[PDB]
């Protein structure tokens, strides 16, 4: 047995006001309709340009553990039931996307209608998944932070777009560095931002001009258009204040949601500290992550919460 | 309070025998000569083609926590005092290697002798560092450790002693990795055709109808001789056996671990008292896995089962 009200009194602290959490982080207004064994399509979190054949492996509160059919369960991952990068069976085909078939299946030999029959499986219904016009369009070029090497701002392209969300690709870099985002992302910048902020812009591998890079030459050579400066929107500040409490998914063992504290604040990030555990477990995370939640999110959703160690 | 002896009688299991461990995993012959502040050169574990200016941030047991000078403490990493990818000050200049200087330092403006006199620091004494058929330029077929389904066209781009650096042609260098002649991840040219596997050709190469012969002449390189690739005998680690394993998630800690599952060259470590979702695979010749008593013998704290 463990209550937040008693804990906030004992510690003499305040929770991050619920009003500071966005719709995808806040209390769901509905129940989790997903059931184990339901099939769907979805983005690979490690290879974000790839759509894979997924199966609901576990249902816990408002979250689902997704399994990559035919692949090892060591690759299994957690998402909320309202996640944006999960889609119903037939979505890739209807929206013009390439779907990676299960392991040992060739694209040219994969059919959903026949696969669900073979598996004696049911597709996750379309309703379990049930836009402000942005300036971004597929093919558009900008400057973006390589989230894996954050000291690098590179030449990038919008290579995919789903509703108001788009996939950032780094030209002539492999696709494992790709990531999804939106107009207000603090990681994306318009062409010329780097020169303006006295920053080095990392140029495409194999591109002869490294130190003498011209955006206008590159845009002619690639027959591309730049993302308009006006398509980029201001990210309002989160407002989360140091020492404030919340609920955070453990990056390490994501099956758990733990009692967290805002250890330190950034302009768009927060430093999660898991109460009881040592300061070495602390890490940075975006304050608009669907993996950070308000106090009682676990209690309300039916998700077990890990009290302080 | 905790002991391995009482734990072995209570849980009714026998430990991974001392003999089954390699020289870099077993009980060391000497004490830890390193001290906090000592400066050195060493390979970046996440960019294995890069040599960096390091400082002994922390000394604990037969281990050292190393700091990348000028860069965040968030990149600090742990190695054993007898690690092979750490070198004394001046080694890169001696061996014609490229040393990456501290943050904000240009290669053209860095000098150890002056840098040490600026940080009022001492170099790690050379004495602390006194611990193959492959040659630099040789081509082989290697497994991409980050994406193991992939076997690709690779070159040996560096060689230090009997250890060499595997680089994937026309892929970024963050995929590079150091290994030895007995590694299961490396194979001779033609092993994929021979084993009815797909060989990942270099990005930008026209074919993927790929030819190793056209490519070897184009690049003007030699393929590693099939004889240089040496056989690795199996570890002999039976399931339920006990040992000490460095936690990958928080490597400042070494914990009580069981051999949950076994492979030909790998073992599935299970941290006792923890959920099976913490369990991970690891090479059996890893210097992060040690025999029962290694922490107590070296002065490193051991983590009991949770
Ligand atoms: O990043 C990759 C990579 C790795 C893997 C897949 C892949 O086979 N996928 C199917 C299986 C899936 N999940 C399901 C279960 C968990 C893994 C990942 C996507 C992949 N495919 C792909 C094809 C087309 C377009 C873009 C990507 C590309 N490489 C750069 C790094 C490369 N290596 C660098 C060193 C040598 C090669 C290897 C390829
Ligand atoms: O792999 C890299 C990479 C990343 C970083 C460094 C780097 O700045 N280094 C200095 C600092 C050090 N440590 C010290 C503290 C921890 C980090 C690593 C080496 C680097 N340099 C380098 C130059 C020459 C030769 C080989 C490497 C290349 N990229 C492919 C992936 C790239 N991104 C892909 C998407 C867009 C860009 C970015 C660059």
Swiss-Prot record, chain A:
<feature type="repeat" description="MBT 3">
    <location>
        <begin position="213"/>
        <end position="308"/>
    </location>
</feature>
<feature type="repeat" description="MBT 2">
    <location>
        <begin position="110"/>
        <end position="204"/>
    </location>
</feature>
<feature type="repeat" description="MBT 1">
    <location>
        <begin position="2"/>
        <end position="102"/>
    </location>
</feature>
<protein>
    <recommendedName>
        <fullName>Lethal(3)malignant brain tumor-like protein 3</fullName>
    </recommendedName>
</protein>
<comment type="function">
    <text>Is a negative regulator of Notch target genes expression, required for RBPJ-mediated transcriptional repression. It recruits KDM1A to Notch-responsive elements and promotes KDM1A-mediated H3K4me demethylation. Involved in the regulation of ubiquitin-dependent degradation of a set of methylated non-histone proteins, including SOX2, DNMT1 and E2F1. It acts as an adapter recruiting the CRL4-DCAF5 E3 ubiquitin ligase complex to methylated target proteins. Required for normal maturation of myeloid progenitor cells.</text>
</comment>
<comment type="subunit">
    <text>Interacts with RNF2. Interacts (via SAM domain) with SAMD1 (via SAM domain); the interaction mediates L3MBTL3 binding to chromatin. Interacts with RBPJ; the interaction is required for L3MBTL3 localization to chromatin and is impaired by Notch-derived peptides containing the intracellular domain (NICD). Interacts (via SAM domain) with KDM1A. Interacts with DCAF5. Interacts with DNMT1. Interacts with E2F1. Interacts with SOX2. Interacts with SFMBT1.</text>
</comment>
Curated annotation (Swiss-Prot), chain B:
<feature type="repeat" description="MBT 3">
    <location>
        <begin position="210"/>
        <end position="305"/>
    </location>
</feature>
<comment type="subunit">
    <text>Interacts with RNF2. Interacts (via SAM domain) with SAMD1 (via SAM domain); the interaction mediates L3MBTL3 binding to chromatin. Interacts with RBPJ; the interaction is required for L3MBTL3 localization to chromatin and is impaired by Notch-derived peptides containing the intracellular domain (NICD). Interacts (via SAM domain) with KDM1A. Interacts with DCAF5. Interacts with DNMT1. Interacts with E2F1. Interacts with SOX2. Interacts with SFMBT1.</text>
</comment>
<feature type="repeat" description="MBT 1">
    <location>
        <begin position="2"/>
        <end position="102"/>
    </location>
</feature>
<protein>
    <recommendedName>
        <fullName>Lethal(3)malignant brain tumor-like protein 3</fullName>
    </recommendedName>
</protein>
<comment type="function">
    <text>Is a negative regulator of Notch target genes expression, required for RBPJ-mediated transcriptional repression. It recruits KDM1A to Notch-responsive elements and promotes KDM1A-mediated H3K4me demethylation. Involved in the regulation of ubiquitin-dependent degradation of a set of methylated non-histone proteins, including SOX2, DNMT1 and E2F1. It acts as an adapter recruiting the CRL4-DCAF5 E3 ubiquitin ligase complex to methylated target proteins. Required for normal maturation of myeloid progenitor cells.</text>
</comment>
<feature type="repeat" description="MBT 2">
    <location>
        <begin position="110"/>
        <end position="202"/>
    </location>
</feature>
């Amino acid at each position: 047995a463990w209550c937040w009200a008693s804990y906030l009194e004992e510690e003499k602290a305040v929770a991050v006001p619920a009003k500071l959490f966005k719709e995808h982080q806040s209390f769901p207004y509905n129940k989790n309709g997903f059931k184990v064994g339901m099939k769907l399509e979805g983005v690979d979190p490690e290879h974000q340009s790839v759509y894979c054949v997924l199966t609901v492996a576990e249902v816990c509160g408002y979250r689902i553990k997704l399994h990559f059919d035919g692949y090892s369960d060591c690759y299994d991952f957690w998402v909320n039931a309202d996640a944006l990068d999960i889609h119903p069976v037939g979505w890739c085909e209807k929206t013009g996307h390439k779907l990676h078939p299960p392991k040992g299946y060739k694209e040219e030999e994969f059919n959903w209608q026949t696969y669900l029959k073979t598996c004696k499986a049911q597709a996750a219904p379309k309703s379990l998944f049930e836009v402000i016009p942005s300036g971004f369009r597929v093919g558009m070029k900008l400057e973006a932070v390589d989230k894996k090497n954050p000291s690098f701002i590179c030449v990038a392209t919008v290579t995919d777009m789903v509703d108001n969300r788009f996939l950032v690709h780094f030209d002539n870099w492999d696709e494992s560095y790709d990531y999804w985002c939106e107009a207000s992302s603090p990681h994306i910048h318009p062409v010329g931002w780097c020169k303006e902020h006295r920053r080095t812009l990392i140029t495409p591998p194999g591109y002869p001009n490294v130190k003498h890079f011209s955006w206008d030459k590159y845009l002619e050579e690639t027959n591309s258009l730049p993302a308009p400066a006006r398509a980029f929107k201001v990210k309002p500040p989160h407002g989360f204040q140091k020492k404030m409490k919340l609920e955070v998914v453990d990056k390490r063992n994501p099956m758990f949601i733990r009692v967290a504290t805002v250890a330190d604040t950034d302009d768009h990030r927060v430093k999660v500290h898991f109460d009881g555990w040592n300061n070495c477990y602390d890490y940075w995370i975006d304050a608009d992550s669907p993996d950070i939640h308000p106090v009682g999110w676990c209690s309300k959703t039916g998700h077990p919460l890990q009290p302080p160690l």
